[PDB]
Predict the structure.
Amino acid sequence: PAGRRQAIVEAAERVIARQGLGGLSHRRVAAEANVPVGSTTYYFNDLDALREAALAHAANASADLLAQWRSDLDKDRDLAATLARLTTVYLADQDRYRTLNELYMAAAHRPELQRLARLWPDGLLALLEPRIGRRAANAVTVFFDGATLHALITGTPLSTDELTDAIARLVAD
Amino acid sequence: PAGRRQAIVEAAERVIARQGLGGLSHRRVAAEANVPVGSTTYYFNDLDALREAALAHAANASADLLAQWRSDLDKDRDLAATLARLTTVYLADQDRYRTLNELYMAAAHRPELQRLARLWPDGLLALLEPRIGRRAANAVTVFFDGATLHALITGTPLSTDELTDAIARLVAD
């Protein structure tokens, strides 16, 4: 039922992650979801709608991560460590971060996506400001962005240790 | 007939920045360059070749930029404040870093294109490492790349003021 479209949309995220936004096709997603190819035609108006849903799913998924980030950050007082740990998790889900990055690029010239693209980074900033202050919040989100870019380019994310050091240095004071 | 090949190449680069990697086509490049589609197809039989050539062009701009940064780094004693200024100048041209990110993005799903994506990050590392050691060099280049993506996501780059402050934290010791 609605679990069907769900399976299809998650597969499209997996295909977008593996093949890029332009590498998404009905045939690919149907195989990634393991459903008969026609069935991807039933739940979406066209290929572009399937893309939209995939990016939207990754954007709203990521925003609900904030809840759990907020809880973990509020538990203890070693903020840099906790942030480094949480970032390691984020950069562990390669499918999710790639797709989000595809969103960031896509939104650059498709204003129908600017709202979605802003969800996670707007949320992260807001989460961080009252907890570490504006500049630190700024520097940390920027460093986070860098971390994703380096995981993107080299295939391996910075270690939890490498992250703690850098984040520690950005939040200190 | 040239410098026709050059023009086609730069036009392709502009098209990639404007439409995303996936919006590349001979037609758009031909229109952008103001030559017939046949002229573009002569020099670049297939689209991969065209894309590759544009990405290479984009990626080889780094040799020069790095060389430029090397010259400025040598004159001034304050590494942090100089990298910040250099960075502010870089981030002032949205088109420039938009292409960088299109390149990092493409590196994800084309190994052949990975060797081009790495020229800038590895280049910057190599330029800094002897001056400030591995740890700091790598954190700084991560921050820099993070800065490019963040500027693209938000539409406003960090002031040279805050770039200086975070770079300094990152290079200290």
The first helix of chain B runs from residue 4 to 19. Chain B has one domain: 1-173.
